[PDB]
């Protein structure tokens, strides 16, 4: 494959003015300042950029690049995207199971994986866990090699690398560039963008492209770059990295002087004549859910720190709450104690579901990259990150709290009420989680999302029905009580528990209540808060919570579908 | 200045094997891998390392290193330490009041500041802000120039720098080093630790120290290291960066072999021979409180975001809470509504105090640098940064909330109840902030500092007196209610507000209460919760609060006196 680009111009001020050149099979590189065009000409050349701006005809072997280009190509990310909880083998297997052809057997698949990991060099480090912050990881060179290895599986012809060295000590850079060189000796077109390279790298380059502030200051063979500037009038000193010399020409030994001197050089005319001569899904759905749910389940268990922290804090809070409220009595303090513990449970679920913000904000980058590459679709990814990150997590505390506290406290000792309480707490957990996802999906930063969730939650807590009596608010503001999840959770719990109780020792009020203002039964307390006393009165809260779950997950799915993928 | 080190060794793994040489007047650097004595020898030579490890002998001009060295040398920190909101002239003024001599007049001080801004090359921006994340900041190069100049006002002789050009571009690091050379041509022996330079900088040195893994690999004229590595059996190609050349030699194109070859050359013999020949408060407490508080205040004004958002959210919450709770009635819902709004105000004060973790945590490094430099004492700095950053920022919400919601709601319309409520809200805000400081003082990362605060506030809010009756807990646990600040706040507010009320229309229960279980007055409700009815029962809640402040502040102060400055 020999990519080519003529008259490319990008518009979000045109960051890319006019670019012409051919990329023969070798080891070419695009380097410029931070204020040049480095991080954009690659996403242009790799179809990672919007087709709106560009105007030239980026064409391979004459054939204008088809629509299946992106899944056919391979583009290594700037930083590393591999998962720290799985091992190198699982990483190279999850990428070889969604990009390969389902018609082939696992024998050929694992054989190709073995060839890849054995030619790359991580065969000695095959089964070793890649590593997260907590667990001892593998060398960063091996991390970059693993990332380079999750794109050799499909066997492309063109490999794009954006900044393969930004984040590596000067030790591993030579080895990684030698690895790339060894790849390029077999017929792969490697196109990478680099940040101030050392001469221990620049020696082996085939073709150089210099992008100085949105213009093409040079494109041609890279051995003939110092000869370009020495015959331009300057002097070639010694003991200086020629790439730093190039990046220093842009900053005082203007930008529109060299850019118009280059068009005068034969490296423009000869290549333009050459170019004028030249011009003259792969997987199922359930398959795209199996491996996503698998990788997510591994990464959630493989990172026991967060999940065990959750379960430990939940068991400890449950035992503390069971010891403080141990043995609820049926007297004047009984109503206050029951209302307080139920409020605390329904509010703990909501305020602890603020950690669902890390689901899609910590994983935004890899999601976008994998989707643009073509592993899966948005719906399969949604369902495979929701079946193994929100079902096995938010279901546990709802069962643990209900197992521990329900019998230490002494709540309603009946077969159904126990499971109804458990189900209610589960629904509150899932609804707060869905709302956190709706507010958080697509947002690249965590802090503003956490602030929004916190403000929404304190307002719903105000309208929950313990602080202010929901039947005393002025009618022009009372409708605000229907937009709050804690209110439905607390209403369901209060209904489930307060129905058949008495709180006045010696006083049977079920008959004729003497001397009102007493609040001597659970039904009087229930109606004072504005709560129905029918089974529909209990189950409409669950209907509302289900509808909230549906609406919020639909909003999250729409925010994932319409996201700016380029 | 002529610094001269000898036979130094440091241990917590004794890191520095054996060092030897002088640092003559000129411009001399130390470079090498990240694991040598690069960030170690410079910290040791400048008396900033803990002196319990040094086994060698430092010397300034033959005499042992004097005590006032820290106040007679200049240690320019690597990264930025200047305040963002203050101005290039205000910073040079604040770093000129506390370090200089109060005997002299402001005429002399401003003359010195002027002759300093002349040399520093900043006569164009002296009157404009240095800049922060929100306001348009001056270029980072002028930031670094300002941070340097802040250490020229005392006119030290020895200037110590560390990685002065890490976080810059190519042509600005060159300007920084040209400025440093223009400084060093005065007799001011500059000594900096550089990191992977381009030879353009390397050409302007006068002595050099290669430190790899903790061994002197070379020391002497920095126009000789290439000659020292050439005449040892190596070859240097053109177009290589000599600093990168040595940092590649350190990896072997072996530490304990290149670390032993040096001893057997003349560039060790000469240094050791010349060495063996050469070896054979400034301000009143008020002048430190005034300027510290003044600088902190000027920095607060130059921060519209935080303080303006605080005021805005307090006003919005005041109006929302006065709308929801507008016109508290004296009926059965009155007790619930009053308890709810007072509980809400107290937990608001507490959970909003959490935002004071960034007071002694985000300005840590600057504190350590300025204290070791000899700016001020711990008590003066503590009282300064606690009388402008915290004193007038916790008074305003407790004023706005009272003034706004006291007459919308319709609380006790007497002259002193209003002021008691304001005083209580301010006291509980101050106590919660004191606890926040006691936890956050002496921690470098915010997250682990905020998790514990949120846990403690959740526990205190459980024990605060609304979610559980404090008279019903078992005695082996009921003593924990004396560790809750929200409990004292909420008890004082309830006492001040509930005392002389009736809540049953048509029933006068002041004398005989007919049909008890009714709760028809404020005395009944107050005693039901375990609160006193005498005036002492209002003010113990206050002394406790005051006590906590004192105690917690003391703790914070101690966590700043025994904090490991070195």
């Amino acid at each position: 494959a020999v990519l080519s680009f003529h008259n490319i111009c990008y518009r979000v001020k045109e960051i890319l003015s006019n670019i012409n050149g051919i990329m023969k099979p070798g080891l070419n590189a695009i380097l410029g300042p931070t204020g040049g065009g480095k991080s954009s000409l690659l996403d242009v050349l790799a179809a990672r950029k919007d087709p709106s701006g560009l105007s030239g005809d980026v064409l391979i072997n004459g054939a204008p690049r088809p629509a299946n280009f992106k899944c056919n190509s391979g583009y290594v990310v700037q930083d590393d995207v591999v998962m720290g909880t799985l091992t190198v083998r699982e990483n190279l297997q999850f990428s070889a199971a969604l990009r390969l052809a389902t018609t082939m057997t696992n024998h050929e698949k694992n054989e190709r994986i073995n060839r890849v990991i054995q030619e790359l060099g991580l065969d000695k480090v095959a089964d070793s866990k890649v590593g997260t912050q907590f667990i001892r990881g593998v060398s960063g060179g091996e991390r970059k090699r693993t990332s380079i290895g999750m794109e050799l599986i499909t066997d492309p012809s063109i490999l794009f690398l954006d900044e393969p060295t930004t984040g590596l000590d000067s030790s591993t850079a030579n080895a990684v560039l030698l690895l790339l060189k060894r790849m390029s000796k077999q017929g792969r077109t490697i196109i990478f963008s680099i940040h101030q390279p050392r001469y221990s790298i620049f020696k082996l380059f085939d073709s150089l492209t210099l992008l100085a502030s949105g213009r093409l200051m040079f494109h041609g063979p890279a051995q003939e770059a110092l000869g370009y500037f020495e015959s331009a009038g300057y002097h070639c000193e010694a003991y200086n990295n020629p790439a730093d010399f190039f990046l220093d020409i842009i900053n005082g030994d203007l930008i529109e002087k060299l850019a118009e001197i280059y068009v005068n050089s034969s490296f423009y005319k000869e290549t333009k004549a050459e170019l004028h001569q030249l011009s003259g899904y792969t997987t199922s759905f359930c398959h795209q859910l199996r491996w996503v749910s698998k990788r997510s389940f591994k990464n959630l268990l493989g990172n026991p720190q967060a999940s065990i922290a959750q379960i430990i804090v939940t068991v400890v809070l449950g035992l503390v709450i069971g010891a403080i409220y141990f043995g609820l009595k049926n007297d004047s303090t009984g109503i206050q104690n029951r209302a307080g513990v139920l409020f605390f449970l329904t509010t703990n679920q909501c305020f602890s579901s603020v950690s669902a913000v890390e689901l899609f904000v910590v994983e935004k980058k890899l999601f976008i990259h994998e989707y643009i590459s073509g592993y899966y679709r948005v719906s399969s990814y949604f369902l495979g990150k929701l079946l193994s990150d929100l079902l096995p997590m938010r279901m546990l505390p709802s069962i643990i709290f209900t197992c521990i506290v329900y019998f230490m406290l002494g709540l309603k000792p009946k077969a159904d009420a126990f499971f109804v309480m458990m189900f209610t707490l589960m629904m509150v957990a899932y609804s707060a989680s869905s709302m956190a996802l709706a507010i958080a999906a697509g947002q690249s930063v965590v802090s503003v999302a956490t602030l929004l969730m916190t403000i929404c939650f304190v307002f719903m807590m105000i309208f929950s029905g313990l602080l202010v009596n929901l039947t005393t608010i002025a009618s022009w503001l009372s409708w605000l009580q229907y937009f709050s999840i804690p209110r439905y959770g607390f209403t369901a719990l209060q209904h489930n528990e307060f129905l058949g109780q008495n709180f006045c020792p010696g006083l049977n009020a079920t008959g004729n209540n003497p001397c009102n203002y007493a609040t001597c039964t659970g039904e009087e307390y229930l109606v004072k808060q504005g709560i129905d006393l029918s089974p529909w009165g209990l189950w409409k809260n669950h209907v509302a919570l289900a509808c909230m779950i549906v609406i919020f997950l639909t909003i999250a799915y729409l925010k994932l579908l319409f996201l700016k993928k380029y | 200045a002529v610094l001269s080190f000898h036979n130094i060794c440091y241990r917590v793994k004794e890191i520095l094997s054996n060092i030897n040489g002088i640092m003559k007047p000129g411009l001399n650097a130390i470079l090498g891998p990240t694991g040598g004595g690069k960030s170690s020898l410079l910290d040791v030579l400048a008396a900033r390392k803990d002196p319990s490890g040094l086994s060698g002998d430092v010397l300034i001009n033959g005499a042992p290193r004097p005590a006032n060295f820290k106040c007679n040398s200049g240690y320019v920190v690597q990264d930025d330490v200047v305040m963002g909101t203050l101005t290039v002239r205000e910073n040079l003024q604040f770093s000129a009041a506390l370090r200089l001599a109060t005997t002299m007049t402001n005429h002399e001080k401003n003359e010195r500041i002027n002759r300093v801004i002349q040399e520093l090359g900043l006569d164009k921006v002296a009157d404009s802000k240095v800049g922060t994340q929100f306001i348009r900041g001056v270029s980072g190069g002028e930031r670094k120039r300002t941070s340097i100049g802040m250490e020229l006002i005392t006119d030290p002789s020895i200037l110590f720098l560390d990685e002065p050009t890490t976080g810059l571009d190519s042509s600005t690091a060159n300007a920084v080093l040209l400025l440093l050379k223009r400084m060093s041509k005065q007799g001011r022996t500059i000594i900096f630790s550089i990191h992977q330079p381009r030879y353009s900088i390397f050409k302007l040195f006068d002595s050099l120290t290669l430190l790899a893994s903790g061994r002197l690999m070379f020391h002497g004229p920095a126009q000789e290291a290439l000659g020292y590595f050439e005449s040892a059996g190596y070859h240097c190609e053109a177009y290589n960066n000599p600093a990168d050349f040595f940092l590649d030699i350190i990896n072997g194109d072996l530490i304990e072999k290149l670390a032993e070859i040096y001893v057997n050359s003349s560039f060790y013999k000469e240094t050791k021979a010349e060495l063996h020949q050469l070896s054979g408060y400034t301000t009143s407490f008020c002048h430190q409180l005034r300027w510290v508080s003044k600088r902190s205040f000027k920095n607060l004004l130059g921060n519209p975001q935080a303080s303006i958002a605080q005021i805005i959210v307090t006003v919005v919450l005041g109006l929302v809470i006065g709308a929801i709770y507008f016109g508290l009635k004296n009926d059965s819902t009155g007790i619930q509504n009053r308890a709810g709004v007072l509980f809400f105000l107290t937990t608001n004060q507490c959970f909003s105090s959490v935002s004071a973790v960034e007071l002694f945590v985000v300005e840590k490094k600057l504190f350590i640098h300025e204290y070791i430099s000899g700016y001020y004492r711990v008590s003066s700095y503590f009282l300064g940064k606690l009388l402008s950053d915290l004193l007038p920022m916790r008074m305003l919400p407790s004023i706005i909330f009272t003034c706004i919601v006291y007459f919308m709601l319709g609380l006790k319309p007497k002259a002193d109840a209003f002021f008691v409520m304001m005083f209580t809200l301010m006291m509980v805000a101050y106590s919660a902030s004191s606890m926040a400081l006691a936890i956050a003082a002496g921690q470098s990362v915010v997250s682990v500092a905020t998790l514990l605060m949120t846990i403690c506030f959740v526990f205190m809010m459980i024990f605060s007196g609304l979610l559980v009756n404090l008279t019903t807990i078992a005695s082996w646990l009921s003593w924990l209610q004396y560790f809750s600040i929200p409990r004292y706040g909420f008890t004082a507010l309830q006492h001040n507000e509930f005392l002389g009320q009736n809540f049953c229309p048509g029933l006068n229960a002041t004398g005989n209460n007919p049909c008890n279980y009714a709760t028809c007055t404020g005395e009944e409700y107050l005693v039901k919760q375990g609160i006193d009815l005498s005036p002492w029962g209002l003010w113990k809640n206050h002394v406790a609060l005051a006590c906590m402040i004192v105690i917690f502040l003391t703790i914070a102060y101690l966590k700043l006196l025994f904090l490991k400055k070195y």
Partner: antibody
Framework: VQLQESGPGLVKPSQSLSLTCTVTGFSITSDYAWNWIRQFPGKKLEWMGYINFDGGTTYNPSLRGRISITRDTSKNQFFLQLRSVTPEDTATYYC????????????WGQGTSVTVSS | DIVLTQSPSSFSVSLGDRVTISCKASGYILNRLAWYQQKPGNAPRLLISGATSLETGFPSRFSGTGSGKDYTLSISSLQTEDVGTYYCQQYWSTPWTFGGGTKLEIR
């Protein structure tokens, strides 16, 4: 306790109306709440508001800004001031008494017809 | 606001036969239901308080039975001194609302 009512039995439209009631046999600052209750032609009933034994007052939300109840604690009286009258306020007023520990309107007045015309 | 309703806004009955009046409400009143009896030209005179109890000066004929949102007064064997309107008041919530009143008649 026994209640008496007095006032003008005819007011001109878009004006004020003022009724008074003397409570003999009890103290209107001792125990109960004291309300006004009007009965239309056609025999519908409507509670208007009450003044408490301690001064607090609460009115029917249908009459906002149009009704005030005040008390002369010196000579045991309370007063109904119904401003911005209309011809549809052609009913008796009764001025009943409400205990509170029992909940019901225990004692009633005698009723005085008030016609509103011109 | 809780709005009472005496669906049989009239009744017709001879002397000595049982009669039953219903006062279905529009919310849970929780036995906070009172029955007043108004005569021609007099003020109402409380007859039942609490939807079950009975006041003094009245015989044991009048009875009150109900729960939830449905309550009924029951006059078994009504005599001559029983004609007149019957209002059902609730004293649960803040605006105390009355019923339409079922004017009894005789035959």
């Amino acid at each position: 306790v026994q209640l008496q009512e007095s006032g003008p039995g005819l007011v001109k439209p878009s004006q004020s109306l003022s009724l008074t009631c003397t409570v003999t046999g009890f103290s209107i600052t001792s125990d109960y709440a004291w309300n006004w209750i009007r009965q239309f032609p056609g025999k519908k009933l409507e509670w208007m508001g009450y003044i408490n034994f301690d001064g607090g007052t609460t009115y029917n939300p249908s009459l906002r800004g149009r009704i005030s109840i005040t008390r002369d604690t010196s000579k045991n009286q309370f007063f109904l001031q119904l401003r911005s009258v209309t011809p549809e306020d052609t009913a008796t007023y009764y001025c009943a008494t409400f205990y509170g520990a029992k909940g019901t309107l225990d004692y009633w007045g005698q009723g005085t017809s008030v016609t509103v015309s011109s | 606001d809780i709005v009472l309703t005496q669906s049989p806004s009239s009744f017709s009955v001879s002397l000595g036969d049982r009669v039953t009046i219903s006062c279905k409400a529009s919310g849970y009143i929780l036995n906070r239901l009172a029955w007043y009896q108004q005569k021609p030209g007099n003020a109402p005179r409380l007859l039942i308080s609490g939807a079950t109890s009975l006041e003094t000066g009245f015989p044991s004929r009048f009875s009150g039975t109900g729960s939830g949102k449905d309550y009924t007064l029951s006059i078994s064997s009504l005599q001559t001194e029983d004609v007149g309107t019957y209002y059902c008041q609730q004293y649960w919530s803040t605006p105390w609302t009355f019923g339409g009143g079922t004017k009894l008649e005789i035959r």
